[PDB]
Design a protein around this motif. Sequence first.
Motif, PDB file in Angstrom:
ATOM      1  N   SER A 194       0.797  -1.224   0.000  1.00  0.00           N
ATOM      2  CA  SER A 194       0.000   0.000   0.000  1.00  0.00           C
ATOM      3  C   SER A 194       0.835   1.282   0.000  1.00  0.00           C
ATOM      4  O   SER A 194       0.369   2.323  -0.454  1.00  0.00           O
ATOM      5  CB  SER A 194      -0.959  -0.006   1.204  1.00  0.00           C
ATOM      6  N   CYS A 195       2.069   1.197   0.477  1.00  0.00           N
ATOM      7  CA  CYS A 195       2.931   2.360   0.588  1.00  0.00           C
ATOM      8  C   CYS A 195       3.530   2.840  -0.719  1.00  0.00           C
ATOM      9  O   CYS A 195       4.004   3.974  -0.789  1.00  0.00           O
ATOM     10  CB  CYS A 195       4.049   2.076   1.580  1.00  0.00           C
ATOM     11  N   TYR A 196       3.537   1.986  -1.741  1.00  0.00           N
ATOM     12  CA  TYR A 196       4.092   2.375  -3.027  1.00  0.00           C
ATOM     13  C   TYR A 196       3.327   3.558  -3.567  1.00  0.00           C
ATOM     14  O   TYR A 196       3.923   4.581  -3.908  1.00  0.00           O
ATOM     15  CB  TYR A 196       4.055   1.226  -4.037  1.00  0.00           C
ATOM     16  N   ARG A 197       2.005   3.411  -3.642  1.00  0.00           N
ATOM     17  CA  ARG A 197       1.141   4.465  -4.159  1.00  0.00           C
ATOM     18  C   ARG A 197       1.232   5.708  -3.258  1.00  0.00           C
ATOM     19  O   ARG A 197       1.407   6.820  -3.728  1.00  0.00           O
ATOM     20  CB  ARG A 197      -0.306   3.960  -4.241  1.00  0.00           C
ATOM     21  N   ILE A 198       1.154   5.483  -1.958  1.00  0.00           N
ATOM     22  CA  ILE A 198       1.228   6.541  -0.973  1.00  0.00           C
ATOM     23  C   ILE A 198       2.507   7.366  -1.091  1.00  0.00           C
ATOM     24  O   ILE A 198       2.445   8.596  -1.090  1.00  0.00           O
ATOM     25  CB  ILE A 198       1.112   5.952   0.450  1.00  0.00           C
ATOM     26  N   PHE A 199       3.655   6.702  -1.185  1.00  0.00           N
ATOM     27  CA  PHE A 199       4.938   7.398  -1.278  1.00  0.00           C
ATOM     28  C   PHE A 199       5.135   8.092  -2.621  1.00  0.00           C
ATOM     29  O   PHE A 199       5.671   9.202  -2.681  1.00  0.00           O
ATOM     30  CB  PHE A 199       6.085   6.424  -1.038  1.00  0.00           C
ATOM     31  N   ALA A 200       4.720   7.421  -3.700  1.00  0.00           N
ATOM     32  CA  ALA A 200       4.714   8.020  -5.033  1.00  0.00           C
ATOM     33  C   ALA A 200       3.979   9.366  -5.010  1.00  0.00           C
ATOM     34  O   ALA A 200       4.497  10.379  -5.489  1.00  0.00           O
ATOM     35  CB  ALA A 200       4.037   7.080  -6.030  1.00  0.00           C
ATOM     36  N   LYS A 201       2.768   9.357  -4.444  1.00  0.00           N
ATOM     37  CA  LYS A 201       1.956  10.571  -4.327  1.00  0.00           C
ATOM     38  C   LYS A 201       2.560  11.566  -3.336  1.00  0.00           C
ATOM     39  O   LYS A 201       2.512  12.768  -3.568  1.00  0.00           O
ATOM     40  CB  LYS A 201       0.510  10.261  -3.924  1.00  0.00           C
ATOM     41  N   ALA A 202       3.112  11.069  -2.232  1.00  0.00           N
ATOM     42  CA  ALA A 202       3.764  11.944  -1.231  1.00  0.00           C
ATOM     43  C   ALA A 202       4.862  12.800  -1.856  1.00  0.00           C
ATOM     44  O   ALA A 202       4.878  14.016  -1.677  1.00  0.00           O
ATOM     45  CB  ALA A 202       4.346  11.132  -0.078  1.00  0.00           C
ATOM     46  N   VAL A 203       5.766  12.160  -2.594  1.00  0.00           N
ATOM     47  CA  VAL A 203       6.921  12.838  -3.176  1.00  0.00           C
ATOM     48  C   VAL A 203       6.667  13.384  -4.602  1.00  0.00           C
ATOM     49  O   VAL A 203       7.567  13.966  -5.198  1.00  0.00           O
ATOM     50  CB  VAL A 203       8.150  11.903  -3.152  1.00  0.00           C
ATOM     51  N   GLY A 204       5.457  13.197  -5.135  1.00  0.00           N
ATOM     52  CA  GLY A 204       5.124  13.662  -6.484  1.00  0.00           C
ATOM     53  C   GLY A 204       5.860  12.920  -7.591  1.00  0.00           C
ATOM     54  O   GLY A 204       6.187  13.492  -8.633  1.00  0.00           O
ATOM     55  N   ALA A 205       6.122  11.636  -7.370  1.00  0.00           N
ATOM     56  CA  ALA A 205       6.736  10.787  -8.388  1.00  0.00           C
ATOM     57  C   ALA A 205       5.742  10.465  -9.504  1.00  0.00           C
ATOM     58  O   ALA A 205       4.563  10.293  -9.245  1.00  0.00           O
ATOM     59  CB  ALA A 205       7.235   9.511  -7.733  1.00  0.00           C
ATOM     60  N   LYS A 206       6.223  10.394 -10.741  1.00  0.00           N
ATOM     61  CA  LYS A 206       5.430   9.841 -11.843  1.00  0.00           C
ATOM     62  C   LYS A 206       5.357   8.335 -11.622  1.00  0.00           C
ATOM     63  O   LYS A 206       6.382   7.697 -11.395  1.00  0.00           O
ATOM     64  CB  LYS A 206       6.061  10.184 -13.203  1.00  0.00           C
ATOM     65  N   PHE A 207       4.151   7.764 -11.663  1.00  0.00           N
ATOM     66  CA  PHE A 207       4.010   6.319 -11.448  1.00  0.00           C
ATOM     67  C   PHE A 207       2.984   5.686 -12.359  1.00  0.00           C
ATOM     68  O   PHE A 207       2.105   6.374 -12.847  1.00  0.00           O
ATOM     69  CB  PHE A 207       3.716   6.007  -9.985  1.00  0.00           C
ATOM     70  N   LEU A 208       3.133   4.381 -12.593  1.00  0.00           N
ATOM     71  CA  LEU A 208       2.178   3.601 -13.381  1.00  0.00           C
ATOM     72  C   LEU A 208       1.710   2.395 -12.542  1.00  0.00           C
ATOM     73  O   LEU A 208       2.518   1.592 -12.077  1.00  0.00           O
ATOM     74  CB  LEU A 208       2.803   3.163 -14.707  1.00  0.00           C
ATOM     75  N   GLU A 209       0.400   2.300 -12.348  1.00  0.00           N
ATOM     76  CA  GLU A 209      -0.222   1.194 -11.646  1.00  0.00           C
ATOM     77  C   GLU A 209      -0.911   0.326 -12.691  1.00  0.00           C
ATOM     78  O   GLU A 209      -1.832   0.791 -13.326  1.00  0.00           O
ATOM     79  CB  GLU A 209      -1.296   1.697 -10.686  1.00  0.00           C
ATOM     80  N   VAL A 210      -0.458  -0.915 -12.874  1.00  0.00           N
ATOM     81  CA  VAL A 210      -1.157  -1.891 -13.714  1.00  0.00           C
ATOM     82  C   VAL A 210      -1.454  -3.134 -12.887  1.00  0.00           C
ATOM     83  O   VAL A 210      -0.530  -3.760 -12.388  1.00  0.00           O
ATOM     84  CB  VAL A 210      -0.316  -2.343 -14.944  1.00  0.00           C
ATOM     85  N   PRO A 211      -2.740  -3.518 -12.767  1.00  0.00           N
ATOM     86  CA  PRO A 211      -3.091  -4.651 -11.908  1.00  0.00           C
ATOM     87  C   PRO A 211      -2.541  -5.995 -12.375  1.00  0.00           C
ATOM     88  O   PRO A 211      -2.459  -6.272 -13.583  1.00  0.00           O
ATOM     89  CB  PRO A 211      -4.628  -4.673 -11.918  1.00  0.00           C
ATOM     90  N   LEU A 212      -2.175  -6.826 -11.409  1.00  0.00           N
ATOM     91  CA  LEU A 212      -1.862  -8.223 -11.683  1.00  0.00           C
ATOM     92  C   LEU A 212      -3.041  -8.866 -12.386  1.00  0.00           C
ATOM     93  O   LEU A 212      -4.175  -8.413 -12.239  1.00  0.00           O
ATOM     94  CB  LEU A 212      -1.579  -8.974 -10.383  1.00  0.00           C
ATOM     95  N   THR A 213      -2.767  -9.912 -13.165  1.00  0.00           N
ATOM     96  CA  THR A 213      -3.822 -10.638 -13.865  1.00  0.00           C
ATOM     97  C   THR A 213      -4.687 -11.380 -12.867  1.00  0.00           C
ATOM     98  O   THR A 213      -4.365 -11.446 -11.670  1.00  0.00           O
ATOM     99  CB  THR A 213      -3.271 -11.694 -14.827  1.00  0.00           C
ATOM    100  N   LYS A 214      -5.778 -11.945 -13.381  1.00  0.00           N
ATOM    101  CA  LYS A 214      -6.677 -12.799 -12.604  1.00  0.00           C
ATOM    102  C   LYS A 214      -5.923 -13.913 -11.875  1.00  0.00           C
ATOM    103  O   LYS A 214      -6.347 -14.329 -10.812  1.00  0.00           O
ATOM    104  CB  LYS A 214      -7.736 -13.438 -13.513  1.00  0.00           C
ATOM    105  N   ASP A 215      -4.821 -14.396 -12.452  1.00  0.00           N
ATOM    106  CA  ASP A 215      -4.025 -15.476 -11.853  1.00  0.00           C
ATOM    107  C   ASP A 215      -2.830 -14.972 -11.047  1.00  0.00           C
ATOM    108  O   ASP A 215      -1.913 -15.736 -10.748  1.00  0.00           O
ATOM    109  CB  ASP A 215      -3.537 -16.402 -12.954  1.00  0.00           C
ATOM    110  N   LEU A 216      -2.846 -13.688 -10.698  1.00  0.00           N
ATOM    111  CA  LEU A 216      -1.780 -13.056  -9.916  1.00  0.00           C
ATOM    112  C   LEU A 216      -0.447 -13.032 -10.656  1.00  0.00           C
ATOM    113  O   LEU A 216       0.623 -13.047 -10.049  1.00  0.00           O
ATOM    114  CB  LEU A 216      -1.611 -13.733  -8.552  1.00  0.00           C
ATOM    115  N   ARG A 217      -0.506 -13.007 -11.979  1.00  0.00           N
ATOM    116  CA  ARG A 217       0.716 -12.898 -12.757  1.00  0.00           C
ATOM    117  C   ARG A 217       0.945 -11.423 -13.120  1.00  0.00           C
ATOM    118  O   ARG A 217       0.001 -10.630 -13.197  1.00  0.00           O
ATOM    119  CB  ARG A 217       0.663 -13.806 -13.979  1.00  0.00           C
ATOM    120  N   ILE A 218       2.215 -11.077 -13.298  1.00  0.00           N
ATOM    121  CA  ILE A 218       2.628  -9.753 -13.713  1.00  0.00           C
ATOM    122  C   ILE A 218       2.112  -9.522 -15.112  1.00  0.00           C
ATOM    123  O   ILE A 218       2.313 -10.359 -15.986  1.00  0.00           O
ATOM    124  CB  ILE A 218       4.171  -9.623 -13.713  1.00  0.00           C
TER     125      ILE A 218
END
Lengths: 333, 335
Positions: B108-132
């Motif tokens: 949960s801290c990845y998104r939080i810290f990205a937003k805290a420090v104003g980092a450019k970030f990309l969130e793409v969800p894991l697949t239905k089978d928890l694969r990258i």
Amino acid sequence: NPLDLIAKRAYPYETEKRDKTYLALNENPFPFPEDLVDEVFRRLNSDALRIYYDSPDEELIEKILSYLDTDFLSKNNVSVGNGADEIIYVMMLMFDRSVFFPPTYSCYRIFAKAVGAKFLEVPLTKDLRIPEVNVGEGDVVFIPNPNNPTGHVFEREEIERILKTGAFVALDEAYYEFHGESYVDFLKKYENLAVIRTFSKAFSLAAQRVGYVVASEKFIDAYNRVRLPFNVSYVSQMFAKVALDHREIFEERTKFIVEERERMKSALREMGYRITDSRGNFVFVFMEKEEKERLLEHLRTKNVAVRSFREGVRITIGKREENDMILRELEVF
Amino acid sequence: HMNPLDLIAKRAYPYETEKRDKTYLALNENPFPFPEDLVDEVFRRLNSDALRIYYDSPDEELIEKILSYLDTDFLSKNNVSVGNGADEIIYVMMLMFDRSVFFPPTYSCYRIFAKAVGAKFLEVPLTKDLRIPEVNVGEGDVVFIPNPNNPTGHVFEREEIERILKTGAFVALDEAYYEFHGESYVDFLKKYENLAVIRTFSKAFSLAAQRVGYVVASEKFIDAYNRVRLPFNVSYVSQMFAKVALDHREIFEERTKFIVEERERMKSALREMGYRITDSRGNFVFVFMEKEEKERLLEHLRTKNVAVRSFREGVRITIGKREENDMILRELEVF
Ligand SMILES: Cc1ncc(COP(=O)(O)O)c(CN)c1O
Ligand SMILES: Cc1ncc(COP(=O)(O)O)c(CN)c1O
């Protein structure tokens, strides 16, 4: 290869093997009292070590507030950092541009470059006054008071002049304890001000990293959103709490450091050295590159470390014998 | 038309401290206190004169002991550094790279810290089978992959990570739960410059309140990291706690063995009950529940002074002592 850019952009990291008589980082000469180390450990809950411990806890904030001793501050006006360094670092992440005035704290430039902050360096005047500068909302201006490395004190009008621009003033009061006047009261009048403090110099807790910041509620809220949530450890907080509960010893140490500083300042004047009117735990001596380097080399052979700057040397107050050794080295030279 | 303090308040999540219930199973903390004998050993080794100096972070001894723990032939002191928690290491890495990439459900801290420090970030969800998922990444990116994953505890295949390494993107492999799984991808640093492994003392060594993380990477990266981070970032006493823990690892090994057996016992009981769970290899289990049935469980737990961690698709339940675990299973059985 972003890591190559950081090699180019940011200053290299180095660990330096300390000399026998080390007077180069403005550290207190005295070890943290043994009785208080004991109290720290009989206050520790081993069950508390396993958890994410609030930073700051409520008790540490109450004691800092008691130390500050105002009528108008509450718990929402105070937060903590992993050293004053962390507070500075985080503030540089918070504003559009950072402004500071050489000769100043060396970590301002380092941290600005480290994090890729936009920064403006404008030198203090020949008289160590804050220069005319175009600053406003969006800027944070870092002013150490007393100044590092000169130890000199900016007049209140100077600080206020910046405050009236709308720029955010970060007043770094790392050496407050050796001077004894704080501009914290200006928070009654200005929302655009933060005062930064530390336990590292006056309480002999440099290895434990506890800084604090005093500001408006709006700022403290914002700071607490940007910083790491668990930034100061349980035991560091306990060291700071115990130090605050036993201030008399630290007051006596401070009293010795200031008397020793003024005694050194007098002797250096009598010798004909040009010095600053330092109000920190150090003296600043002006010297020419050639005089400086010959003195440095001699100190090098006697296993002594001081801090070299462009215009001279900053010598931390140590023990009576260390201070006398310094005066003797400067007399021959 | 907005001063910088208002902008921060807009973009960054609020600072919020938690109130701890009598049975707290919500932050992946070790159930056991740091051993008393070892606290006294720390007090014993403590030099009060060292307290007054800017103490090296990390000191040489701490590094030696971390290398010995890692137990490779190929790592040196130049391959290792420290953080004020693994959290600081993540935070600094976000300052280091042009873009941060991570894959929900994740820490949960990845998104939080990205937003805290104003980092450019990309969130793409894991697949239905928890694969990258398939993602367009390359040099300039840092891809945060916890392994075991948080909150699922599931383990990514080596091929998944090796596919990302071959893009040229920098992989930050967050091995916070390594100790409860037992396989590490540190040996990849023989081959890939392109990788950092992040570790912590917080979970397996019961030192969450003292904040010691470490990172293992190429010399180039460690050099860069050491330039961007705070120079005095881990305290003298935190370092002494970590050094003393590493000198006495047998107790921590028995605790980890108890936690993993306890985890597998709970995983079996939940399967037998008909719950859909992940194959977790952390110090926790993850239970899939439909939103509305999940809320009902939460009221029951709240009523009984039990905290767990609620997620979009279910609850992450940290392993505690046998008695808390037994109680969790009752409440999931009766429910
Ligand atoms: C002006 C100034 N500000 C901040 C600091 C940092 O002190 P801390 O140990 O609490 O990070 C120092 C000492 N390095 C300093 O001289
Ligand atoms: C995936 C992950 N990474 C890093 C961390 C941080 O560990 P630390 O307590 O040393 O900051 C945690 C725990 N908060 C975690 O769950």
